[PDB]
């Protein structure tokens, strides 16, 4: 499938990135915690960035191209995590 949503949940503790089809079926996901970041690091935008990349590169295998993005939560990740989706190749 080509088109999909990137659900970014940036909390103060963690940044999760799920990528789904339009029907909200999960394609792939990654989180700061899933990349082995711990404590302060998970909060940081860099971790959000890397989480977005890992979630994205999982999606590109299934063959995505365009992403709608949804952001939740007050974390600092959303700006970094979205750039990372653009940087991974998927158009926002």
């Amino acid at each position: 499938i080509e088109s999909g949503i990137a659900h970014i949940r940036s909390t103060f503790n963690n940044t999760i990135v799920t990528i789904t089809d339009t029907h909200g079926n999960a394609i792939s996901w990654s989180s700061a915690g899933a990349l082995g970041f711990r404590g302060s690091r998970k909060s940081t935008p860099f971790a959000a960035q890397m989480a977005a990349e890992t979630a994205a590169k999982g999606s590109i295998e299934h063959g995505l191209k365009t992403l709608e993005v949804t952001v939740k939560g007050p974390g600092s990740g959303r700006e970094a995590a979205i750039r990372a989706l653009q940087a991974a190749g998927l158009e926002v």
Partner: protein, 67 residues
């Protein structure tokens, strides 16, 4: 996991090595699969925790001795 960490450390120990970002390490190691990228991130975190590598303020990884 350990063989991958050793290989990454060996690469960073080379005399020509300059501090690289995660993306520059991905490119230089020819990592193309999302599972290998996950291994790289886990290895960087584990090596940074052990103090065998250091992340700079510009998100570049380097060897402590060379810095």
């Amino acid at each position: 996991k350990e063989a991958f960490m050793e290989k990454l450390l060996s690469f960073m120990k080379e005399e020509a090595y300059k501090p690289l970002t995660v993306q520059e390490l991905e490119e230089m190691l020819n990592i193309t699969e999302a599972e290998e990228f996950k291994e790289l991130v886990k290895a960087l975190v584990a090596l940074e925790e052990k103090g065998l590598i250091v992340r700079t303020r510009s998100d570049r990884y380097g060897i402590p001795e060379k810095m």
